[PDB]
Amino acid sequence: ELGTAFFQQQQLPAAMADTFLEHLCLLDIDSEPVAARSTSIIATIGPASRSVERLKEMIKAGMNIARLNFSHGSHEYHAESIANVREAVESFAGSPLSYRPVAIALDTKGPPGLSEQDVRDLRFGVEHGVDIVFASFVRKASDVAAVRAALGPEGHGIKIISKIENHEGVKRFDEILEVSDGIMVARGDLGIEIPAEKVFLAQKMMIGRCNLAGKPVVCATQMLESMITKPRPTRAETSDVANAVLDGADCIMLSGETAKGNFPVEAVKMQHAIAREAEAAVYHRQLFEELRRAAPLSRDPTEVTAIGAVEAAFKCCAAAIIVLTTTGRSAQLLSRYRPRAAVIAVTRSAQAARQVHLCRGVFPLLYREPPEAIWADDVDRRVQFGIESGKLRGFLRVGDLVIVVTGWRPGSGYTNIMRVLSIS
Amino acid sequence: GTAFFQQQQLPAAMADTFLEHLCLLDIDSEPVAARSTSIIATIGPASRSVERLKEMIKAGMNIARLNFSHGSHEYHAESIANVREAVESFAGSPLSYRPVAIALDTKGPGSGPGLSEQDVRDLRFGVEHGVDIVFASFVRKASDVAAVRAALGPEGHGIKIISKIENHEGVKRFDEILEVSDGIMVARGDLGIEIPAEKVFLAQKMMIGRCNLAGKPVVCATQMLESMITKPRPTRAETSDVANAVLDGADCIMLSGETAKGNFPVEAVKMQHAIAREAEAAVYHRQLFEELRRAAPLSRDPTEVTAIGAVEAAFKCCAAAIIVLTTTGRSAQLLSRYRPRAAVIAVTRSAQAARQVHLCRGVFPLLYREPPEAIWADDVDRRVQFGIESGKLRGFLRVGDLVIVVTGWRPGSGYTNIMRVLSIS
Amino acid sequence: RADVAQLTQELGTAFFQQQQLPAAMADTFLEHLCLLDIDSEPVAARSTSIIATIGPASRSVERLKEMIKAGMNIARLNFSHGSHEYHAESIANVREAVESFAGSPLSYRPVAIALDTKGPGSGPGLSEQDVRDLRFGVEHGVDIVFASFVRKASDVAAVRAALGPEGHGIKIISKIENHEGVKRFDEILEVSDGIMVARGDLGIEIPAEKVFLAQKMMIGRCNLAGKPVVCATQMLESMITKPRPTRAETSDVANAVLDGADCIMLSGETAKGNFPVEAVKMQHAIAREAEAAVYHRQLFEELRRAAPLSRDPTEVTAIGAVEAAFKCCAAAIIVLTTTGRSAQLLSRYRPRAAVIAVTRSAQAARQVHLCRGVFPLLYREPPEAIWADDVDRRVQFGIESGKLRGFLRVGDLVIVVTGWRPGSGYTNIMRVLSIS
Amino acid sequence: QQQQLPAAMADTFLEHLCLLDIDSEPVAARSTSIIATIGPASRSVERLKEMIKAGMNIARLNFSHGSHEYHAESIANVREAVESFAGSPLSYRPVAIALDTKGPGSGGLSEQDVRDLRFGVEHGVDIVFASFVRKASDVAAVRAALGPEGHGIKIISKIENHEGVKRFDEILEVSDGIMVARGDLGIEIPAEKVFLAQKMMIGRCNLAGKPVVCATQMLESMITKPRPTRAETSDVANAVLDGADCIMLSGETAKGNFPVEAVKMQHAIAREAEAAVYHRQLFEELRRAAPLSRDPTEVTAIGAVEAAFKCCAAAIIVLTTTGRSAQLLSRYRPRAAVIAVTRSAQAARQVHLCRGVFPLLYREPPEAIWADDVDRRVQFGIESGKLRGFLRVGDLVIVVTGWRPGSGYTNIMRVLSIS
Ligand SMILES: O=C(O)CCNS(=O)(=O)c1cc2c(c(O)c1O)C(=O)c1ccccc1C2=O
Ligand SMILES: O=C(O)CCNS(=O)(=O)c1cc2c(c(O)c1O)C(=O)c1ccccc1C2=O
Ligand SMILES: O=C(O)CCNS(=O)(=O)c1cc2c(c(O)c1O)C(=O)c1ccccc1C2=O
Ligand SMILES: O=P(O)(O)OC[C@H]1O[C@](O)(COP(=O)(O)O)[C@@H](O)[C@@H]1O
Ligand SMILES: O=P(O)(O)OC[C@H]1O[C@](O)(COP(=O)(O)O)[C@@H](O)[C@@H]1O
Numbered sequence A: 001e002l003g004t005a006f007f008q009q010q011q012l013p014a015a016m017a018d019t020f021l022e023h024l025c026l027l028d029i030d031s032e033p034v035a036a037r038s039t040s041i042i043a044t045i046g047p048a049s050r051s052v053e054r055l056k057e058m059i060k061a062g063m064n065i066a067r068l069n070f071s072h073g074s075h076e077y078h079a080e081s082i083a084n085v086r087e088a089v090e091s092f093a094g095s096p097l098s099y100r101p102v103a104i105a106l107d108t109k110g111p112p113g114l115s116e117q118d119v120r121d122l123r124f125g126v127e128h129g130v131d132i133v134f135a136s137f138v139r140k141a142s143d144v145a146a147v148r149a150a151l152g153p154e155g156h157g158i159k160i161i162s163k164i165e166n167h168e169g170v171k172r173f174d175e176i177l178e179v180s181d182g183i184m185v186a187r188g189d190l191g192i193e194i195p196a197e198k199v200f201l202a203q204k205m206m207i208g209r210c211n212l213a214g215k216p217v218v219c220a221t222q223m224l225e226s227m228i229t230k231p232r233p234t235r236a237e238t239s240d241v242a243n244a245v246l247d248g249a250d251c252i253m254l255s256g257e258t259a260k261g262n263f264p265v266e267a268v269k270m271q272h273a274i275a276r277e278a279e280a281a282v283y284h285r286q287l288f289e290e291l292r293r294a295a296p297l298s299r300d301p302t303e304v305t306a307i308g309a310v311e312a313a314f315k316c317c318a319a320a321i322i323v324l325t326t327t328g329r330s331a332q333l334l335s336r337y338r339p340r341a342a343v344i345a346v347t348r349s350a351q352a353a354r355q356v357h358l359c360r361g362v363f364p365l366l367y368r369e370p371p372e373a374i375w376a377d378d379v380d381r382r383v384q385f386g387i388e389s390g391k392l393r394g395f396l397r398v399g400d401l402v403i404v405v406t407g408w409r410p411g412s413g414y415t416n417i418m419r420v421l422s423i424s
Numbered sequence B: 001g002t003a004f005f006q007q008q009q010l011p012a013a014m015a016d017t018f019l020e021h022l023c024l025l026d027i028d029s030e031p032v033a034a035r036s037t038s039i040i041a042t043i044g045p046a047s048r049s050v051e052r053l054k055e056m057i058k059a060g061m062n063i064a065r066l067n068f069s070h071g072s073h074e075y076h077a078e079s080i081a082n083v084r085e086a087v088e089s090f091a092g093s094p095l096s097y098r099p100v101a102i103a104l105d106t107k108g109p110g111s112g113p114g115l116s117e118q119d120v121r122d123l124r125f126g127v128e129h130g131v132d133i134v135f136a137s138f139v140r141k142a143s144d145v146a147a148v149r150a151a152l153g154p155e156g157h158g159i160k161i162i163s164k165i166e167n168h169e170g171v172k173r174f175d176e177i178l179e180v181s182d183g184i185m186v187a188r189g190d191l192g193i194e195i196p197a198e199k200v201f202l203a204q205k206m207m208i209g210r211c212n213l214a215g216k217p218v219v220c221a222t223q224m225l226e227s228m229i230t231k232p233r234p235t236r237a238e239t240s241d242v243a244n245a246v247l248d249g250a251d252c253i254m255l256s257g258e259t260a261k262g263n264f265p266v267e268a269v270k271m272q273h274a275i276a277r278e279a280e281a282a283v284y285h286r287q288l289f290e291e292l293r294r295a296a297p298l299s300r301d302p303t304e305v306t307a308i309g310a311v312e313a314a315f316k317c318c319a320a321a322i323i324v325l326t327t328t329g330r331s332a333q334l335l336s337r338y339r340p341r342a343a344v345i346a347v348t349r350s351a352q353a354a355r356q357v358h359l360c361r362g363v364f365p366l367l368y369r370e371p372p373e374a375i376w377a378d379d380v381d382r383r384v385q386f387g388i389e390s391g392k393l394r395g396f397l398r399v400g401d402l403v404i405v406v407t408g409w410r411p412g413s414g415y416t417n418i419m420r421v422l423s424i425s
Numbered sequence C: 001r002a003d004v005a006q007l008t009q010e011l012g013t014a015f016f017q018q019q020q021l022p023a024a025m026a027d028t029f030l031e032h033l034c035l036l037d038i039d040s041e042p043v044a045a046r047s048t049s050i051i052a053t054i055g056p057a058s059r060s061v062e063r064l065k066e067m068i069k070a071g072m073n074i075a076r077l078n079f080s081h082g083s084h085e086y087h088a089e090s091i092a093n094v095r096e097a098v099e100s101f102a103g104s105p106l107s108y109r110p111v112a113i114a115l116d117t118k119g120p121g122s123g124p125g126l127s128e129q130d131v132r133d134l135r136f137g138v139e140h141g142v143d144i145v146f147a148s149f150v151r152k153a154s155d156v157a158a159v160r161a162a163l164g165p166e167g168h169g170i171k172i173i174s175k176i177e178n179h180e181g182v183k184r185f186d187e188i189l190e191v192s193d194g195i196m197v198a199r200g201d202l203g204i205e206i207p208a209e210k211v212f213l214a215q216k217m218m219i220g221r222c223n224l225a226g227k228p229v230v231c232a233t234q235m236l237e238s239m240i241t242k243p244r245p246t247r248a249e250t251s252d253v254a255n256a257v258l259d260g261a262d263c264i265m266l267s268g269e270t271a272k273g274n275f276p277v278e279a280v281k282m283q284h285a286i287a288r289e290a291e292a293a294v295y296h297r298q299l300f301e302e303l304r305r306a307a308p309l310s311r312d313p314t315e316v317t318a319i320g321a322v323e324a325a326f327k328c329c330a331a332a333i334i335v336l337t338t339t340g341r342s343a344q345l346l347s348r349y350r351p352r353a354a355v356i357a358v359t360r361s362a363q364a365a366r367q368v369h370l371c372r373g374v375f376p377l378l379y380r381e382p383p384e385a386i387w388a389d390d391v392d393r394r395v396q397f398g399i400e401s402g403k404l405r406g407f408l409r410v411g412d413l414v415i416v417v418t419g420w421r422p423g424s425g426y427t428n429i430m431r432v433l434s435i436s
Numbered sequence D: 001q002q003q004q005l006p007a008a009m010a011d012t013f014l015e016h017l018c019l020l021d022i023d024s025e026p027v028a029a030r031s032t033s034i035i036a037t038i039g040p041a042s043r044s045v046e047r048l049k050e051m052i053k054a055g056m057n058i059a060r061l062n063f064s065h066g067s068h069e070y071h072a073e074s075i076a077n078v079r080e081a082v083e084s085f086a087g088s089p090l091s092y093r094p095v096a097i098a099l100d101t102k103g104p105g106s107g108g109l110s111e112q113d114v115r116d117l118r119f120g121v122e123h124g125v126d127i128v129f130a131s132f133v134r135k136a137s138d139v140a141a142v143r144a145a146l147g148p149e150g151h152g153i154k155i156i157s158k159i160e161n162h163e164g165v166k167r168f169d170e171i172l173e174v175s176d177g178i179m180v181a182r183g184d185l186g187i188e189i190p191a192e193k194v195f196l197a198q199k200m201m202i203g204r205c206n207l208a209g210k211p212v213v214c215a216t217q218m219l220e221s222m223i224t225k226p227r228p229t230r231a232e233t234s235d236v237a238n239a240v241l242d243g244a245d246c247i248m249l250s251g252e253t254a255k256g257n258f259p260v261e262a263v264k265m266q267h268a269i270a271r272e273a274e275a276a277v278y279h280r281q282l283f284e285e286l287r288r289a290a291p292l293s294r295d296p297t298e299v300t301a302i303g304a305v306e307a308a309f310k311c312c313a314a315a316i317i318v319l320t321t322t323g324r325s326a327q328l329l330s331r332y333r334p335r336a337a338v339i340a341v342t343r344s345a346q347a348a349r350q351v352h353l354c355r356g357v358f359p360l361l362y363r364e365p366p367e368a369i370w371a372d373d374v375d376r377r378v379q380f381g382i383e384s385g386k387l388r389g390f391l392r393v394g395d396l397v398i399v400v401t402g403w404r405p406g407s408g409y410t411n412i413m414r415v416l417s418i419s
C-alpha cells in the first residue's frame, strides 16, 4: 500500500480537513514537503549575478526565469548577461538530472503610449529570442496591443505579461488581462501610485482573477528586500513569500536581491525553501471545488480532459500528470486546476519548455529524439521519456500511479485523452 | 442554445443551495435524458404471455422477477422460457435490442435459522436455468449470504446476490450484510410488519444512502403503485413514493402485484418509467457529486480512477453519454456510482453482464454480437461505433454531441484505464 | 466530536442517540441519510399540524374528543359537500369537544376551524355559492379559508372582499390545483396567508408524474417566504377502508414533512373512512419520526443564506433566538404574541426546539397551528397593573405549563422571546433561562 | 459598496478575492489592537500622546532590556499621557500595560523573572507576555510568581521554539492567550516554517476563543525608513487575515526614528485587512466549530452575533465586569464593533487583547435602581458610539446584558434602533 508515513508528509492531515479553519489548525512544522517546488522563481540578472559561474549556482538553487530590466544597463550589457545565462544553462546539457530550461524575460523601461526606447528594446528581445516580456505600466488594453505590434513578424510567440503598477491598471484590470498572456503585480510602483496599505488588496484581487482566468500571475518586488545586505531575511519577508504562494501566484520574483545584492544565491534558495513549504499548505479541497464551480462549462476537449485528469490525480494521489504539449497550452490548462501532482510537460519546442515555467506546477522536459514514422510509437516514446526522467529526478518510483494526457492525432490543439498507467 | 438550458431541470441544477434548487423545479422543464432507474417487474398470470412480455419490454421493464414463494419449478421454467422468447424476438435488430435480466426471489428461511432446504433446491434450479440475480429473502447476517453463495455452487459464481432486508436484525446488521452482498433490496412489505410502519422510510433512506456510498446497487420495493393492481391511475402518495425513491438514490424500483396479478401491468411499468424520468432530472447533482467524491476514499485502482475522471469530464462538457466497454459490468458500475447526468452506454459481448448491469442506475446495456476483429484496436473501435449507432437510433445521441469513451489498454476484464473526449459525427 | 464533547458529557450519550441526533451532526446530507436509525426514538412534541376533514365518520362529540387526543389540530369543513346546516352542526360539535378540555388551562388544546370552498367551477372568478359560504364562515367565526382553484392574485382579492369587514382576521390559504395556479404561484403567494398543494385536482390538471415537482417547488417557495404550506390529498388513502396504510402512503407523509410542509391533511380518511382516529394517529406517528430526520444543519444554513438582510426587530430577534436554541439544544422557545406573527417568524427558521406561543387571542391560538412547531397556549388571566409584571406572569405560565406538559424539565435551557412595549409588532428581546 | 461589501457578498472565497476593491473605503473602526514596545524613542509623555492618538492600545515593556527604574518611569509616562485625555469621558481611550519577561535562558523560572514579575504586580500591570513558554508547568510557575495580588493579570504565553509549538495545546489550555514570537521562533526552527506555526497557532486560538498576538519584524525597515517595504505591509495584512487579535511593534517603536508613523501604518493596514475578511465563510466555520454549550453567556453571544449580521448592526453594546461577555462575542468575529461598557479600569485595558472589542470606562454616577443603572450604561455606549463615529441615528444595535448584578449572568440580547 502507501504506508502511514506517506499520509503524515506534505501537510496531508491538513489537506483532509473539512473546513479551512480546521486545515489551518492541522498545519504541522514536522510534516515535510515531498513534492517538487512548483512556484517558479524569477531572478533579475545584474552586476551581482552576471557571471557564468554565479549563474550556474543560481540555476542549481532554483532560478527558472532570468529577468533583464531594460530600465538599467544597455543592449550590449543585457546581451552579455543573456549569453552568460544560456552558457550556464547549457553547461548542464550533458546530464539529464541537472539540465533545466531557463526562460529569458525582458522587462521594459515603460512609457502617452509606447516609448521609442520600448520599441527598440522589444525589437532587441525578438532578435535575441526572448521568451517573455514583462511590460511596464500597462494601463489599458491598447497598451498591450502596442506591445504586441512591436513584437513584429517574428515575435508573436513571445508571452506578454502586463505589469500593473498604478490605479488605472488596477481599475482597467479585466480589459488588460483579456488581451495579455498574464500579469505581474508590480508592487514597487503600485505602492507609490496607490496607498501602501491597499497594495495587498490589489495583489489578492489580481491573483484571484488570474487564477479564475487560468492565466499566469507573478508576485513581485521587495519579497526578500533585506537580503540585499543581510544573509537571512526578516519574519515579514518569509511570510510575504509564503502568502504570495497561498494567494495563488504562479511565480515569485527577486529584483535587487539578485541584481545587486550580496546574497543572490541565498535569496533564490530562500524563495525555493519557502515556496515548497507553502505549496504543501495550500487547501486543495476548497481551491479545486471553487475553481471547478467558477469555471464555466466547456466543449473544448483540452479543457475537458484537463479537469478529468486533475480529478483523477487527486483520487489516487498521483505522483505526476505527464502531458505531451507543443505550445504548452495543454499543460497550462492542467495547471489552472492546481493539482497537487506535478505536471511533467514533454515538448519538442525549446521555447514552450522555457515559457511553461510561467504556470505553477509545470516541469518542462525538452525532447530532442527524431520523430518516429508511426505516430503512436512517437507518443509512447515521449510518455516513457517523461516516466524515466521522473524516475531519475525523484518524482516517480515503480508501483506509483501517474495520469497521462495526450491527444488522438498529431499537432497542437487536439488533446482529448487521459490515461491511468502504473509505473513499471 | 437557450432551449437546451431550459430542459431537464437545468435552471434548478445550477442553484447554489438545495432550497433554491427546489424553488427552481419547473413542471414545464421537460426531461431529455433516457430513464436511468431500472424497473423490476414481477412475473405472474398478468405478465406471462409472450405477447404481453413484448409490450412490457417496450414499456421499460429491465428485470423480470420470479417470486419463488408462488408456483412450482415447472411454472418458473415456463416463465423463464416466455421471458427469453419475448426478449429474443427483438434480437433481429441489434441496434435496438434490449437485454432483460431474470432474478430469482427466494421463498426464504421461514421459521428456520438460515438456509431452508426448499431454498437450496430453488437456488440449484436458478443455476441450472441461468438466472442472473438472486433476491435473497430475509437476510439477517453475513452467514446467510455465504449460505446462498455456497448453494449456487461452482457453476453460479457469476450470479449477483441482492440481499433483501426485511426485519430489524437485517437493518441492525446492515453493514456486515452489504459487505458480502452484491447489493440490497429494501423489502418494505415484510419490513413494514417487522418494524413500526412509521419507521420504514428511515430504514429505506439509510440503506439507499449506505449503498450509494458503497457503490453497490439498491432496490426500492413493494406497494409503490399498489392501487394500480385494480385502478388505471395511481394515487398521489404512490407517484410521490416512486419519485422520492429515485430522489433518495435508488438504483432500481420494483412492481410486485402491479405486474404479477393486476389488470394494468404494462401501464404500471409505463407509470414508473414516466415518474423516474422526471425525478432523475430533479436530482441536485451539484451536491450529490460533491458528496459522493468527498465520501469516497482515495483509490489506487485504475478503473476507479478513470471512472471519476470520466464523470468529471462528462459534467464539464454536458456530455450526452459515457460509452464504456465492459466484460463483467464493473467499469460501468464504477461510472454509475458517481451518478453522472450523462447516460452510461455499456457495450459488452457477455449476455449475462448486459442483463446484470441493469442493477446500476444510468447504465444502458448494449449486447455486441459480432465476432472479434483480428486487430484488437479495430475491435474496440467497432464496439465504440456500435454504441454511437445504437445511441443515435435510440435518441441518446445526435451529431455534434460530445461523448466520453472509457476503454482499457489490453483485452480481458480489469484493465480499464483510458478516458477520451469524442465529438459525434 | 470536539463540537459536541462537553455537551455529550453533560447531557449523556443516551440524549445524543435519540431524535436522530447522530444524523443531525453529520457533515454532509449523504452522511446524514447513512446515520438515520430506526432505534433512535423521537422525543420532541409533533410539530407538523394535522388537518382532519370532518364528516359522517368524525362528527360526534365523543369521536371528536378522540380525534383531538389523537392529534387533530385543524378541523376542515368541505363546502363541496353537505350544507350550511350540516357544517354548522359539525362546527358546534367540534367546539363542544374542544371546550370539554378547557377546565385545565395548563393542558387545553385549541383547534382551528377551516372552511374549504366549493370553487369557481366553470366560471372565471368568485362563484355565487362561494360568496354565500364565505359569509357563513364569517358568521360562524371560522379561523381559516382554504380557497379552491386559486389561479391568480385577483382570485384571492375576491375571497378577501367576500369575507367583508368582519372577516379581516381570517387566514386565506390559496389552494393550487391547476397549471395556471402553478405558473402564477409567486403572485398568488404574495397576497395569500399561505398555500395548499391540493394534489387531487392538480394530479388531473397536470400530468400525474409532475405533481411531485409542483409540491416540492411550492413547499420550498413557501419555506423561503416564511408562509404556511399544506400538503393535501390521498396521503393515507387506503386507510379509508383498511386499518393500516400502504408503504407508499407512510413514505408520502414522511416526505411531505421532509419537503418542508407546515401541515399535512386527511380528507376521506377522516370524513368517511372506517378508521378516522387511526388515520390521525398514523399521521402523528409518521410526522414525529420525519421531523427528527430533517437535516437541520443544511436547512438552517440555507434559510439564512437565502433570507435577505432585515431591519425588522421581530425578524432579527427570531433568527438570534433560533441560533441560541440550536447552540444549547434548548427544550423550547417561549414567545409572547398577540397575532401569532412573532411565533411565525421563529417557525420560518425551523428550530428543533418547540415554539410555545403564549397569547390572549383565542383566534391567534387556533390559527398558529398553520406554522410548523408552534404550540399555542391560551392565557386567560386579566392584566396585572404593571405591564412588566404581566409579561413575566405570561412567561412563567409558559414555563409551568411546559413542565406540566412534559416539554420542559428542571435543568433545561429555554429561550424566551418578548417585546419592549405592549401591542403587536414590538418583539425585540431574547433571553436564555435555566429551568429550576 | 464601502467596507468591501461587494466582496463580502461573494459565494466563494475565490470570488471574494476577485471582488476586493482598492476604491472600497473602510468605514468600521479598526478592530485589531496594536501593541507598541516603549523604549528610548517612545518614552516622553508628548510622544506617548501622539502614539495614543495614532492607535496604540497596549504598551509593552521588554524586561530583557533597561531596568526596574527605567521601566517604572516609562509606565508613569504612559499613564500620564493616557490620563491627559480623561477630561472627555465619551472619547477616553484606555491603554493596557504589558510586561514582557526576560526568560529562562540556561537549563525553570529564573530568579530575574521572579523579581520582574513581582515588579509587575507592584506596578499594576495588566498583562504578562511570558517568554519561552515550552510546557503547561512554565505557565503555572509564572502564575505562582505573580502571587495572590496578581490573580487578575492575563498571562499570554510566548511560543518561541520547537517544544512550545509541539506542546501548544497544553500551553493554550492553561494560558489566557498566545504570542507568536517570530524572532526566536525564526532561529529555533527553520525560517521557512515560521508561517506554518503562525497560521496553526492563530487558527487554534481562534477555535479556542483566546487572544493571539502576531509579533516581531512586522514593519522592521521603519526603524530607519519613513515607509515600510511591500513585504512588511503584506505581513501586517496577512496577520489580520490569518485571524490575529493583536499585532505588535518592537524596535519600530522602542528605538526607531518613526515610532508614531509605524503605529499609523499598522492602524491603516489593519483597517483595510479587517474589511477584506471573508465573514461569510469565517462566521460559518467559527459557528460550526464552536462547541454546543449550556452556558448562558456563550448562548447569548452566538445569538447576538447572528442577530448583528442579520441587520448589519453598527455595534453590539455589552456590559461586562471581567471582559468575558465581550470576549465571547469577539470569538465569533462579528463585523459589528463590540462596545464593552465596564466600570473595571483593568478589564477595560485587558479587553484590548480581543479583536473588535472597544472598551468604554464608565465613570458616571450610579443609579439607585439597578434596571435604570443598566439602561444608563447602555445609553453611555450609545453616546460614546455617536461621538466616536461608530453609530448614527437610524442604525440598529444589539445590546447584551444580564439578569442580575455581578459577573457570569449575561443572558439577554435586545435589538435597539438608535435615537
Ligand atoms: O528601480 C530601481 O532602481 C530598482 C531596480 N531593481 S533591479 O531591476 O533588480 C536592478 C537591475 C540592475 C541593477 C540594479 O542595482 C538593480 O537593483 C544595476 O545596478 C545594473 C547596473 C548596470 C547594468 C544593469 C543593471 C541592472 O539591470
Ligand atoms: O370529492 C372529493 O374529492 C372530496 C371528498 N373528501 S372529503 O372532503 O374529505 C369528504 C367530505 C364529506 C363526505 C365525504 O365522503 C368525503 O370524502 C361525505 O360523505 C359527506 C356527507 C354528508 C355531508 C358532508 C359530507 C362531507 O363533507
Ligand atoms: O531584538 C531584541 O532582542 C528585542 C529588542 N526590541 S524591543 O524590545 O522593542 C527594544 C527595547 C528596548 C530598547 C530597544 O532598542 C529595543 O529594540 C532599548 O534601546 C532600551 C534601552 C534602555 C532601556 C530599555 C530599552 C528597551 O526596552
Ligand atoms: O498543448 P498543445 O500545444 O495543444 O499540444 C497537444 C498535442 O500534443 C499531442 O499529444 C501530441 O502531438 P504531436 O505528436 O504533434 O507532438 C497531440 O495529440 C495534442 O494535440
Ligand atoms: O469492466 P471490466 O469487466 O473490467 O471490462 C473492461 C475491459 O474491457 C475492455 O475495454 C475490452 O476488452 P475485451 O476486448 O476483452 O472485450 C478491456 O480493455 C477492459 O479491461
Ligand SMILES: O=P(O)(O)OC[C@H]1O[C@](O)(COP(=O)(O)O)[C@@H](O)[C@@H]1O
Pocket (backbone or CB within 6 Å): C336, C337, C338, C339, C340, C341, C342, C343, C417, C418, C419, C420, C421, C422, C423, C424, C425, C426, C427
Ligand atoms: O407577535 P406579535 O403579534 O407582534 O406580538 C408581540 C407582542 O407581544 C408582547 O410581547 C406583549 O404585548 P401585550 O402586553 O400587548 O400582550 C409585545 O411586547 C410584543 O410587541
Ligand SMILES: O=P(O)(O)OC[C@H]1O[C@](O)(COP(=O)(O)O)[C@@H](O)[C@@H]1O
Pocket (backbone or CB within 6 Å): D319, D320, D321, D322, D323, D324, D325, D326, D400, D401, D402, D403, D404, D405, D406, D407, D408, D409, D410
Ligand atoms: O462579562 P461578565 O464579567 O460576566 O459581566 C457580565 C455582567 O454584567 C452585567 O451586565 C452588569 O452587572 P453589574 O451591574 O454588576 O455591573 C451583569 O448582569 C452580567 O452578569
Ligand SMILES: O=C([O-])C(=O)[O-]
Pocket (backbone or CB within 6 Å): A136, A163, A165, A185, A186, A187, A188, A189, A190, A220, A221
Ligand atoms: O517594475 C516593478 O517591478 C515594480 O514596480 O515593482
Ligand SMILES: O=C([O-])C(=O)[O-]
Pocket (backbone or CB within 6 Å): B137, B164, B166, B186, B187, B188, B189, B190, B191, B221, B222
Ligand atoms: O419480499 C418482499 O418483496 C417484501 O416483503 O416486500
Ligand SMILES: O=C([O-])C(=O)[O-]
Pocket (backbone or CB within 6 Å): C148, C175, C177, C197, C198, C199, C200, C201, C202, C232, C233
Ligand atoms: O381540493 C382538494 O383538496 C384537492 O384537489 O386535492
Ligand SMILES: O=C([O-])C(=O)[O-]
Pocket (backbone or CB within 6 Å): D131, D158, D160, D180, D181, D182, D183, D184, D185, D215, D216
Ligand atoms: O520575544 C519576541 O518577541 C521574539 O522572539 O519574537
Ligand SMILES: [K+]
Pocket (backbone or CB within 6 Å): A069, A070, A071, A107, A108, A109, A110, A136
Ligand atoms: K523595467
Ligand SMILES: [K+]
Pocket (backbone or CB within 6 Å): B067, B068, B069, B105, B106, B107, B108, B137
Ligand atoms: K419471495
Ligand SMILES: [K+]
Pocket (backbone or CB within 6 Å): C078, C079, C080, C116, C117, C118, C119, C148
Ligand atoms: K372543496
Ligand SMILES: [K+]
Pocket (backbone or CB within 6 Å): D062, D063, D064, D100, D101, D102, D103, D131
Ligand atoms: K523579553
Ligand SMILES: [Mg+2]
Pocket (backbone or CB within 6 Å): A136, A165, A186, A188, A189
Ligand atoms: Mg515598476
Ligand SMILES: [Mg+2]
Pocket (backbone or CB within 6 Å): B137, B166, B187, B189, B190
Ligand atoms: Mg418479503
Ligand SMILES: [Mg+2]
Pocket (backbone or CB within 6 Å): C148, C177, C198, C200, C201
Ligand atoms: Mg380540489
Ligand SMILES: [Mg+2]
Pocket (backbone or CB within 6 Å): D131, D160, D181, D183, D184
Ligand atoms: Mg523572543
